[PDB]
Amino acid sequence: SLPDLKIEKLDEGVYVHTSFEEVNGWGVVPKHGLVVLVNAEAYLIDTPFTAKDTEKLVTWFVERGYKIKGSISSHFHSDSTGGIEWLNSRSIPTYASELTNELLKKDGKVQATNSFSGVNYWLVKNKIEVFYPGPGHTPDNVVVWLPERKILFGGCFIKPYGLGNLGDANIEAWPKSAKLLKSKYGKAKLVVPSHSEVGDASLLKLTLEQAVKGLNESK
Ligand SMILES: CCOC(=O)[C@]1(CS)N[C@@H](C(=O)O)C(C)(C)S1
Ligand SMILES: [Zn+2]
Ligand SMILES: [Zn+2]
Numbered sequence: 001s002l003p004d005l006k007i008e009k010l011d012e013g014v015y016v017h018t019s020f021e022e023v024n025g026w027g028v029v030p031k032h033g034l035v036v037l038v039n040a041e042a043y044l045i046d047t048p049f050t051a052k053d054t055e056k057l058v059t060w061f062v063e064r065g066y067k068i069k070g071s072i073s074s075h076f077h078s079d080s081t082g083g084i085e086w087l088n089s090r091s092i093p094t095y096a097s098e099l100t101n102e103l104l105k106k107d108g109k110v111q112a113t114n115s116f117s118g119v120n121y122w123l124v125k126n127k128i129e130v131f132y133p134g135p136g137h138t139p140d141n142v143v144v145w146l147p148e149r150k151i152l153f154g155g156c157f158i159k160p161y162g163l164g165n166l167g168d169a170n171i172e173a174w175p176k177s178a179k180l181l182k183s184k185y186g187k188a189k190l191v192v193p194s195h196s197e198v199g200d201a202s203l204l205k206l207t208l209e210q211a212v213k214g215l216n217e218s219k
Contacts, residue, residue: 002028005053006058011149013037016192017057019048021079026165031079031194034153036146037066038127044071045128045144045153046194047083054083058092068092071128072123073112074104074155075141077168079194085110093120095123097132099140131184133157134177135170136211143181150189158193160206163214171218174211182208 006018015035023029032110033046035057042061047054058068070093075081081104084094088110096104096112104111109121129145137156144153155179156164182204185191191203 001031005056005122006059007035008199010034010190010192011151014146014149014151016198017044017048019050019053028133029195030212032192033080033194034144034192035061036128036148038069038124042066043069043124043128044083044087046074046080046088046155049079049082051083051086053097055183057083057092059152061074070095070114071112072096072128072144073100073158074098074144074153074194075138076100076107076109077138078109078157080155081109081112084112086161088113095138097130097154099144100142103138103140131181132150132182134173136174136177137163138168139170141184143183145188150187151192152185152188152190153192154181154194154203154207156194158191158196158203158207159210160193160196160203161210163210164195166214171211171215175208175215178204178208193202 008016010016017033036043054096072095087094094112095114098115098117101111101115119132132142141157188201
């Protein structure tokens with residue numbers, strides 16, 4: 001059996017959720033997202049892989065008196081978006097980029113109910129920022145910045161030890177995108193990847209290195 005959903009406190013008002021899925025050719029894959037609390041309201045930064053774990057995650061916070069105000073998905077793959085359909089059935093607002101929703105639609109998947117377009121977007125003004133660094137892991141991948149805590153959720157874009165599945169990646173653009181990300185958040189206290197442990201801003205440097213290598217390798 002797969003490991004259970006985990007929820008762990010990372011900082012004041014910031015929790016990491018980890019869910020697990022068997023993915024062909026990789027075996028058991030962990031996926032980290034966040035829950036961010038603003039007063040008595042909770043925001044999901046990426047859904048778990050499944051509806052089941054999305055329900056478990058929501059239930060946990062609601063039973064502790066936090067109202068789920070919305071989710072945002074950092075890219076179209078189902079490790080960030082698998083719970084959108086269940087959230088929509090419960091009338092909890094879901095958010096994704098215009099490009100992410102276009103890629104969901106193209107793949108015949110449920111879309112987020114709200115979309116945003118542009119390089120920067122405030123999900124919650126002065127608290128939860130979204131930034132598009134450019135194509136990398138996928139054409140649509142965005143990151144989420146919490147300015148009060150100096151925490152960056154890098155999602156599946158942050159790849160310190162190797163780039164992973166390149167099926168939907170843009171390996172030519174990833175170094176440029178990673179350099180932009182490094183330049184913007186070099187002062188981050190914590191960087192949270194989807195698929196490896198939380199670190200500091202060096203994860204931005206290591207990601208840039210791994211992208212520059214992959215592009216070289218591909219020739
Ligand atoms: C169905 C689950 O979603 C996937 O298939 C992912 C989405 S990031 N793709 C893989 C990759 O990039 O190698 C992975 C192992 C990082 S998980
Ligand atoms: Zn992905
Ligand atoms: Zn992923």
